[PDB]
Write a protein that binds this ligand. Structure first.
Ligand SMILES: CCCCCCCCCCC(CCCCCCCCCC)(CO[C@H]1O[C@@H](CO)[C@H](O[C@@H]2O[C@@H](CO)[C@H](O)[C@@H](O)[C@@H]2O)[C@@H](O)[C@@H]1O)CO[C@H]1O[C@@H](CO)[C@H](O[C@@H]2O[C@@H](CO)[C@H](O)[C@@H](O)[C@@H]2O)[C@@H](O)[C@H]1O
Ligand SMILES: CCCCCCCCCCC(CCCCCCCCCC)(CO[C@H]1O[C@@H](CO)[C@H](O[C@@H]2O[C@@H](CO)[C@H](O)[C@@H](O)[C@@H]2O)[C@@H](O)[C@@H]1O)CO[C@H]1O[C@@H](CO)[C@H](O[C@@H]2O[C@@H](CO)[C@H](O)[C@@H](O)[C@@H]2O)[C@@H](O)[C@H]1O
Ligand SMILES: CCCCC/C=C/C/C=C/C/C=C\C/C=C\CCCC(=O)O[C@H](COC(=O)CCCCCCCCCCCCCCCCC)COP(=O)(O)O[C@@H]1[C@H](O)[C@H](O)[C@@H](O)[C@H](O)[C@H]1O
Ligand SMILES: CCCCC/C=C/C/C=C/C/C=C\C/C=C\CCCC(=O)O[C@H](COC(=O)CCCCCCCCCCCCCCCCC)COP(=O)(O)O[C@@H]1[C@H](O)[C@H](O)[C@@H](O)[C@H](O)[C@H]1O
Ligand SMILES: CCCCC/C=C/C/C=C\CCCCCCCC(=O)O[C@H](COC(=O)CCCCCCCCCCCCCCC)COP(=O)([O-])OCC[N+](C)(C)C
Ligand SMILES: CCCCCCCCCCCCCCCCCC(=O)OC[C@H](COP(=O)(O)OCCN)OC(=O)CCCCCCCCCCCCCCCCC
Ligand SMILES: CCCCCCCCCCCCCCCCCC(=O)OC[C@H](COP(=O)(O)OCCN)OC(=O)CCCCCCCCCCCCCCCCC
Ligand SMILES: CCCCCCCCCCCCCCCCCC(=O)OC[C@H](COP(=O)(O)OCCN)OC(=O)CCCCCCCCCCCCCCCCC
Ligand SMILES: CCCCCCCCCCCCCCCCCC(=O)OC[C@H](COP(=O)(O)OCCN)OC(=O)CCCCCCCCCCCCCCCCC
Ligand SMILES: CCCCCCCCCCCCCCCCCC(=O)OC[C@H](COP(=O)(O)OCCN)OC(=O)CCCCCCCCCCCCCCCCC
Lengths: 469, 86, 172, 90, 481, 75
């Protein structure tokens, strides 16, 4: 469906005027919803963990990739709604959030790149999908060319992504030179015992992981996330993380790797410690993303990581979307718009939000306490599954470090709630304006999922036991 | 393996220790891709295998589109500032 | 336990630390003959940390004839002493010593490894309830343990006796 | 040109309630003494006396009690002990 | 029912505008319901009785009768019933003690208070490690919000302490719970004494569990958060925290630790005795040089919890019974003292510095009588439950280790010192010049304090009245070969 | 006790000392948008290669080097 959407959309966006952008985006939003609901029944193919190799052994289809695919569609639906609908109908918000003409096509193509990364069974397909996603994401960074910071960001991103892509291509070709093969499926226990592939496979893993910004190469990505338009940051900080991490989890090429162990430790420490002194909202959220990417990196050191990883990535996607949407909503109550790409920038600008919108702060509290991992919110069960996995496999020191990093990051998670439940002198008296029904309903759905997902935990594990065993 | 490796490493060091210009940066990217491809093609020949050359062709095409997009990004960056002081 | 060769291992550590400090100095220069002038003493940081940690670790391991986390605790204490001497204040020196020693003692307790010892881990170990009369291994569980094992591990007294009281105090 | 919506009307946050007569006559000296005592941790420094109290109570006293408690574990049994019998088990 | 009751709640809210009458009524109904349950509770059996399961896969939204149990387990025995009765006794008084001094966002405040109470009450019903942990952490967001919004001047730092210290301990508790889960693949409390882990594994799990216990009880040397969180909490937060949340720790020892890690507990007991003797002596001494009323009352609780711990790890029936009785008596007395210092004096004068207060007997003789009674109760006068708890706990501790228990007998003196030093200055002397005359204690305040006083006196004159619920428990956990 | 231990040492190994430590460490990790980042990526690659060479030699020798690296970055 995705290819058909891309083709049609190119035709229409060519033949439509600049005023039709939001209507087009609503059209695609509904189309993706329709695909998600009508084609969901293809799950049935994956009963008993049945795996399918497709396209001449280039693509691999199993329950895991089907789930990642559905999750990516859900994320795309939510993200496209933010562009397809106005928060408010005033002039200010027409200036604040207007979709570019080609933005939707870039979004769909980057989604296609991500899905091809997930399904990749062969290194040529992996490299082509990586380059497709990398190019589309460069352009998404750069499409808002009136922003000085966005253009500077796109250029830095181009160069860092190019270097990491060259590292990846080098790793692929060294694997070819040693094994005369482009598939990991050719690998076996005998082959891993016989030959020392550790260097090559770790170089490939590192080349992929530095593209989502794990320490000690974080800062360039945090700067890019800071300097992009806020509705762009909601996307570019999420989809590449999902695709790359899912590919690495599915491939399992760094089991018990000492280098990945040390880098995951370092990423946890830097993500937790470095986010403490932050005063800008989006830099705080980017360091949050770094710490959570560390939590997921830990899962690359062990076999049978499917359940913990899927649960964690789903709850993280929901929490991330929700926190960005809350920051977006809280824009209507700020008294100073900093600029047209990033209306709110400093955490202190939320001060006293509870007096303007009590339930917005309720939602904020719920999402923050999910991030900290307070039961019975989803975040707690995500961390619980991760701890179960790593302790089952004897990563004791890493478990201690994970404890410590969650503690430390709770400080700058609660910074947001702290300033949000403080008091502001000028308190909204009244307003005729209504927030858009659709986005408020979506934000509410995310909040209710985070709050009451745990009631379905046992049902989920029962389903999982029949589709992934 | 020798010419490609040295082009890769020298272009990488040119990229990293660039403190002269951004064009040097573009060029180091392109030449790195060159060296990768030369290593690949020598291996293809030594194995009498077509997969190496197929991936070489794909690299060629992707380096083309990457150059196109990168130069477009540079132009859009220039449009706002009028000058590249590197 | 057969000894570490403290002298040799410490010498190799001196070499590694010197090289690492050199690399850090070169980087520091590039990011900011002046490289060592404007080094900030990082070469000394690396060299001293290396020599202190390795020398103290091997020394303690040889003296106690054991290999466990306590040796890492001592070595971390020495390393922290070196790093906290740079503050030139007694409270900070003591704090570096004790806290680095504690952190490295925790590290050595967990296995002195960042990745896992796969063969000893639970996933690769005999688990679940044991069979008929087998000896208990670390990850296994029973319904009843042998009383002699209790008396030997826990020790006699405080309600731990070889024979249940009522049986022992039965009359005939 | 970027300004919040004119549609918003903002008034004061008043907390309401009945202003009671002020039944305490605050003494500035007492308040400053109280503030100094309350936030003493912000100004604590390690000196000879402070370090001495730290090393006594956090180190020496726990060590003493630990030696006592591990040396005397299971040592005594008193229930119904009679004349001539040892109240000690070891 | 639920639909109709929700309709009733909505209509009452729309018409009256303040939920607090509805919440008071509700909590009273809950108390009556628990009493009905006690009526129908069989005491001649050591088995959990009112069992139910939630979030089972066959019935996620209802109760499960399936042959596979993958949800969360709930049920009660005598030990849980005692603390549940304490909880349902305390909740309505917690609502009532702030009946007039909250004049803003009052509905939210009462909602947070009642939610915290319900969370603790449900926590006592939990029958497996995971649900216990879930409800054990669920309070921290509510406490954080409550303290941050409705607290005194230094409430921001208080809220951050109460969240961070408890999370810090709870995550090590989570490590231990994860190890148990993956090693046993079971989590329940019903049959967890049947699994005999290797001694080394027991010794390792015990560490995480006991670190959680150190932060939550608290014990020396990680007790420094409690005096803050108490002093800047509003009255309901302080009463709940002192009267229930600390007893959650003691219940945690008895339920989670002793049945599973018996041999490791035997190995570690002298370390526990070191830590408890430390907390008693050192916190009791540190109480002498405090200048805030609520801080002093907070420091008292730590010492009483130290005596409770000394009782509960004594490996004797008397020690355990003493720990339970002391927990209950403390839950009666400490909320009353917090009521005094943070609801009567603080609501009349809005200050907590000790220097301002003096000679309150002249204008407020009734308040002075209440202070005298509550203070002699807190320091352990016989015919008060506090004395029975401290005496039995000290007996158990002296049996377990004669030297350590004998030294711990100094707690009687130390408690008398700090408490009577406070009440001496508060009650007598010439009426303070800094403050003016205000009303004496009112009917509501007197009602709450009378409830607490009669409860502690009743269990102090005849502590046996609790035995029918606890005679199984006093044997369920002691480890004698 | 009440001052030097309770509001002294226990707060050092508590809120206040941790606050100072985190302030310093965070300041250091935050303390030419391109050239610098490129130098970073080279330094990471070469440092990783040399560190793994050392690890192959002897893992105990690399622990002080990692400690020193973290000291550079955070302190
Ligand atoms: C152990 C052996 C330590 C021996 C040194 C004692 C020590 C460490 C105590 C740490 C305790 C650790 C406990 C932690 C847990 C342990 C498991 C405390 O020495 C303290 O002694 C007190 C009492 O004498 C002083 O308090 C008051 O002092 C008077 C003011 O009027 C009153 O006379 C007194 O009445 C007050 O009370 C303190 O000022 C003094 O620091 C440090 O003392 C000495 O070390 C040096 C180097 O760092 C310190 O810096 C030096 O002076 C600086 C300008 O001054 C410059 O930088 C520089 O010139 C130099 O570097 C000084 O501090 C120095 O003095
Ligand atoms: C809440 C505070 C948390 C802090 C404490 C955590 C630290 C855990 C330490 C305990 C523990 C993991 C236990 C994990 C349990 C759950 C984890 C708990 C949560 C994780 C956060 C790590 O034990 C480590 O101890 C270190 C010494 O301190 C050693 O350091 C190194 O020493 C030198 C190398 O030889 C080097 O010189 C250097 O590399 C280091 O010096 C390590 O080698 C060692 O692995 C023990 O695990 C292991 O124990 C042994 C025998 O016990 C088990 O095998 C047994 O074999 C027979 C006898 O062997 C028995 O007859 C048999 O019955 C049993 O089969 C194993 O199966 C395995 O299980
Ligand atoms: C765009 C840029 C383009 C530039 C191109 C030019 C660069 C080309 C090469 C660089 C490529 C990229 C470099 C990446 C970083 C290299 C680091 C790296 O791979 O991890 C190491 C390499 O382990 C070596 O044994 C390898 C040792 C390293 C080789 C020795 C060092 C030589 C230097 C001599 C001076 C992988 O071990 P690992 O983690 O699995 O470690 C352990 C361990 O090895 C096994 O025993 C265990 O069984 C296993 O479970 C595992 O846990
Ligand atoms: C398992 C997890 C998977 C999925 C779970 C997520 C969601 C649940 C599934 C399906 C959700 C579908 C919900 C459809 C029903 C929801 C619904 O009442 O209409 C809308 C929102 O409608 C969506 O915005 C529909 C947008 C759908 C996107 C939701 C996805 C999140 C809310 O009504 P509303 O009174 O505010 O709408 C009124 C009214 O319609 C207008 O005439 C008025 O003029 C206007 O003032 C407006 O307020
Ligand atoms: C009418 C068609 C509408 C279906 C549209 C689905 C859209 C997905 C969008 C977002 C993902 C959001 C949550 C996914 C739920 C997992 C389903 C599953 O059970 O996960 C399992 C695998 O468990 C796992 O690994 C762990 C999953 C981690 C979930 C973390 C959140 C838990 C709390 C969510 C509670 C659910 C809300 C219900 C409220 C009444 C895959 O199940 P499956 O592959 O057999 O496909 C399901 C059959 N299906 C296609 C017809 C729908
Ligand atoms: C939800 C289901 C269970 C709720 C049980 C009680 C239902 C009724 C609650 C109620 O009585 O009202 C709540 C409160 C008061 O209503 P109201 O008077 O209208 O507010 C004043 C401004 N309008 O309404 C409000 O004012 C809402 C204000 C929200 C306050 C924001 C911060 C509070 C966050 C709570 C922490 C939750 C964290 C979750 C994590 C785990 C917790 C278990
Ligand atoms: C030669 C023979 C033997 C050699 C042995 C191994 C060589 C090790 C190399 C040592 C690298 C030391 C790091 C370094 O170069 O740091 C310099 C630089 C800091 O520069 P600057 O920006 O001034 O920072 C000051 C803060 N205000 O920092 C940087 O440039 C950033 C750091 C990048 C280094 C990557 C290290 C890999 C990850 C290590 C894990 C850390 C601990 C985790 C456990
Ligand atoms: C709220 C926040 C709460 C935080 C709680 C504290 C967290 C940790 C703080 C730092 C503690 C650092 C511990 C370092 C201990 C040093 C060490 O090397 O431990 C190893 C020691 C012996 O281990 P092993 O090799 O197995 O020898 C068996 C002989 N019977 O193993 C041991 O016997 C244990 C030694 C330490 C005992 C516990 C210390 C306090 C916990
Ligand atoms: C947010 C924190 C995390 C949340 C995790 C858990 C949330 C749970 C939500 C509360 C729901 C639990 C209370 C209702 C469940 C019990 C309903 C019931 O019917 O009891 C079952 C039990 C057996 O009944 P049955 O087998 O059907 O036989 C009847 C014979 N005539 O019959 C009985 O024996 C009676 C049992 C009495 C139970 C008393 C419960 C005390 C408190 C009740 C309300 C608590 C609500 C908590 C709200 C805050 C969230 C914790
Ligand atoms: C942070 C905040 C976290 C909040 C956590 C709270 C989670 C709340 C989940 C509620 C599920 C638990 C309900 C307890 C079960 C009580 C009960 O039995 O309700 C009756 C009915 C099912 O009853 P039945 O299965 O027939 O058994 C009775 C036989 N005598 O039950 C029903 O019909 C279902 C009605 C409940 C619907 C709840 C929907 C969510 C609330 C909005």
């Amino acid at each position: 469906m995705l290819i058909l959407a891309i083709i049609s959309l190119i035709t229409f966006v060519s033949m439509s005027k600049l005023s039709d952008n939001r209507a087009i985006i609503r059209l695609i939003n509904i189309y993706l919803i329709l695909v998600l609901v009508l084609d969901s029944f293809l799950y049935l193919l994956f009963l008993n963990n049945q795996t399918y190799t497709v396209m001449g052994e280039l693509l691999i289809f199993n329950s895991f990739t089907f789930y990642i695919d559905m999750l990516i569609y859900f994320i795309m639906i939510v993200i496209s709604s933010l562009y397809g609908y106005n928060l408010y109908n005033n002039n200010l918000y027409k200036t604040l959030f207007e979709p570019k003409k080609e933005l939707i096509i870039l979004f769909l193509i980057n989604i296609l790149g991500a899905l091809l990364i997930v399904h990749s069974n062969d290194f040529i397909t992996l490299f082509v999908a990586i380059e497709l996603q990398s190019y589309s994401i460069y352009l998404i960074t750069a499409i808002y060319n009136s922003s000085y910071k966005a253009s500077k960001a796109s250029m830095l991103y181009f160069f860092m992504g190019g270097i990491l892509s060259i590292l990846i291509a080098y790793s692929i070709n060294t694997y070819y030179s040693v094994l005369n093969s482009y598939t990991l499926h050719s690998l076996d226990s005998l082959i891993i015992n016989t030959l020392d592939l550790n260097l090559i496979l770790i170089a490939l893993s590192l080349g992929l992981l530095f593209k989502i910004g794990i320490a000690p190469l974080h800062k360039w990505l945090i700067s890019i996330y800071e300097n992009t338009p806020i509705l762009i940051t909601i996307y570019i900080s999420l989809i590449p993380k999902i695709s790359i991490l899912s590919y690495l989890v599915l491939s399992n090429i760094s089991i018990n790797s000492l280098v990945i162990s040390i880098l995951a430790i370092l990423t946890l420490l830097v993500g937790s410690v470095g986010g403490l002194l932050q005063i800008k909202i989006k830099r705080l959220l980017a360091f949050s993303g770094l710490t959570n990417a560390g939590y997921m990196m830990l899962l690359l050191l062990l076999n049978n990581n499917e359940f913990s990883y899927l649960y964690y990535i789903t709850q993280y996607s929901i929490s991330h979307l929700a926190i960005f949407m809350i920051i977006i909503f809280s824009i209507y109550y700020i008294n100073y718009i900093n600029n047209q790409y990033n209306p709110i920038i400093y955490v202190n600008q939320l001060k006293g939000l509870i007096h303007d919108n009590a339930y917005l702060v309720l939602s904020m509290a719920i999402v923050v306490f999910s991030f900290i991992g307070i039961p019975p919110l989803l975040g707690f069960f995500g961390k619980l599954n991760i701890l179960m996995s790593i302790l089952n496999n004897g990563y004791y020191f890493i478990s201690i470090v994970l404890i410590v990093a969650s503690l430390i990051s709770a400080l700058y998670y609660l910074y947001l709630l702290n300033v949000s439940i403080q008091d502001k002198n000028n308190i909204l008296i009244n307003s005729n304006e209504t927030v858009s029904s659709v986005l408020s309903y979506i934000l509410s759905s995310l909040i209710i999922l985070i709050t009451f997902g745990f009631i379905y935990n046992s049902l989920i594990i029962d389903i999982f036991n029949v589709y992934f065993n | 393996m020798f010419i490609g490796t040295i082009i890769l490493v020298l272009s990488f060091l040119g990229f990293v220790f660039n403190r002269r210009n951004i064009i040097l940066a573009f060029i180091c990217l392109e030449t790195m891709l060159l060296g990768i491809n030369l290593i690949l093609l020598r291996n293809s020949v030594l194995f009498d295998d077509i997969s190496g050359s197929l991936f070489a062709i794909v690299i060629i095409i992707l380096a083309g589109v990457e150059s196109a997009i990168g130069l477009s990004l540079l132009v859009s960056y220039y449009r706002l500032r009028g000058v590249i002081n590197s | 336990f057969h000894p570490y060769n403290t002298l040799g291992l410490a010498t190799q550590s001196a070499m590694v630390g010197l090289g690492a400090g050199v690399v850090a100095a070169a980087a520091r220069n590039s990011l900011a003959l002046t490289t060592f002038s404007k080094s900030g003493g990082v070469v000394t940081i690396f060299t001293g940390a290396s020599i202190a940690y390795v020398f103290t670790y091997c020394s303690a391991a040889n003296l106690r004839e054991r290999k466990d986390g306590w040796n890492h605790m001592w070595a971390g204490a020495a390393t922290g002493a070196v790093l906290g001497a740079r503050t030139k204040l007694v409270p900070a020196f003591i704090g570096w010593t004790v806290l680095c020693g504690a952190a490295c003692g925790l590290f050595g307790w967990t296995g002195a490894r960042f990745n896992a010892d796969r063969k000893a881990s639970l996933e690769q170990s005999p688990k679940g309830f044991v069979q008929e009369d087998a000896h208990q291994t670390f990850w296994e569980v029973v319904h009843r343990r042998p009383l002699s094992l209790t008396v030997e591990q826990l020790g006699e007294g405080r309600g731990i006796n070889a024979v249940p009281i009522a049986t022992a105090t039965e009359a005939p | 040109e970027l300004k919040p919506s004119s549609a918003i009307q903002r008034g004061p946050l008043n907390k309401g309630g009945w202003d009671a007569p002020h039944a305490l006559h605050n003494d500035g000296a007492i308040d400053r003494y109280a503030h100094w005592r309350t936030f003493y941790q912000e100004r604590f420094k390690y000196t000879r006396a402070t370090g001495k109290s730290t090393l006594i109570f956090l180190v020496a006293f726990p060590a003493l009690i630990g030696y006592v408690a591990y040396q005397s574990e299971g040592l005594f049994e008193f229930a119904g002990k009679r004349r001539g019998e040892s109240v000690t088990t070891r | 029912i639920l639909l109709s009751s929700l309709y009733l709640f909505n209509r009452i809210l729309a018409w009256q505008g303040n939920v607090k009458h509805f919440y008071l009524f509700a909590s009273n109904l809950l108390l009556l319901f628990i009493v009905v349950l006690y009526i129908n509770f069989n005491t001649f059996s050591n088995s959990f009785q009112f069992n139910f399961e939630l979030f089972n896969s066959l019935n996620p939204f209802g109760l499960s009768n399936s042959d596979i149990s993958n949800g969360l387990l709930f049920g009660i025995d005598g030990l849980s019933l005692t603390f549940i009765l304490l909880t349902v006794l305390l909740i309505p008084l917690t609502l009532l003690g702030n009946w007039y001094n909250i004049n803003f966002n009052s509905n939210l405040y009462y909602t947070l208070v009642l939610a915290i109470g319900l969370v603790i009450l449900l926590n006592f019903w939990a029958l497996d490690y995971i649900s216990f942990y879930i409800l054990f952490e669920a309070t921290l967001p509510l406490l954080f919000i409550l303290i941050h919004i409705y607290g005194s001047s230094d409430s921001e730092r208080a809220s951050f302490y109460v969240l961070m210290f408890t999370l810090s301990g709870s995550l090590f508790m989570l490590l231990s719970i994860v190890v148990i889960s993956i090693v046993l693949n079971t989590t329940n409390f019903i049959n967890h004494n049947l699994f005999v882990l290797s001694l080394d594994l027991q010794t390792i799990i015990w560490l995480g569990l006991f670190i959680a216990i150190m932060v939550k009880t608290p014990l020396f040397p990680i007790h420094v958060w409690l005096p803050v969180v108490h002093s800047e909490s509003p009255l309901a937060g302080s009463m709940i925290l002192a009267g229930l949340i600390l007893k959650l720790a003691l219940y945690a020892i008895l339920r989670l630790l002793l049945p599973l890690l018996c041999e490791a507990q035997i190995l570690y007991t002298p370390m526990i005795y070191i830590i408890s003797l430390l907390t008693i002596i050192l916190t009791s001494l540190a109480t002498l040089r405090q200048i805030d009323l609520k801080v002093i009352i907070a420091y008292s609780s730590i010492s009483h919890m130290g005596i409770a711990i000394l009782g509960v790890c004594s490996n004797t029936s008397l020690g355990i019974y003493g720990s339970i009785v002391l927990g209950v008596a403390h839950g009666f007395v400490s909320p009353a003292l917090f009521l005094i210092v943070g609801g009567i004096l603080y609501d009349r004068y809005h200050i907590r510095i000790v220097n301002y207060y003096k000679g309150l007997t002249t204008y407020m003789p009734q308040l002075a009588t209440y202070i005298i009674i509550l203070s002699f109760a807190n320091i352990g006068t016989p015919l008060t439950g506090n004395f029975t708890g401290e005496f039995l706990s000290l007996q158990g501790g002296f049996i377990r280790n004669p030297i350590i228990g004998g030294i711990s007998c100094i707690s009687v003196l130390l408690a008398a010192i700090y408490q009577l030093k406070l009440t001496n200055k508060l009650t007598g002397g010439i009426s303070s010049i800094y403050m003016h005359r205000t009303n004496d204690v009112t009917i509501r305040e007197k009602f709450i304090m009378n409830i607490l006083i009669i409860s502690t006196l009743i269990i102090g004159i005849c502590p046996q009245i609790m035995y029918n619920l606890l005679y199984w428990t006093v044997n369920n956990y002691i480890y004698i070969i | 006790i009440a001052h030097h231990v309770d509001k002294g040492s226990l707060y050092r190994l508590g809120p206040v000392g941790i606050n100072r430590l985190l302030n310093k460490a965070s300041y250091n990790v935050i303390n030419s948008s391109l050239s610098m980042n490129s130098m970073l990526i080279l330094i990471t690659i070469v440092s990783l290669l040399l560190l793994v060479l050392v690890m192959n030699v002897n893992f105990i020798i690399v622990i002080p080097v990692l400690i020193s690296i973290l000291y550079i970055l955070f302190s």
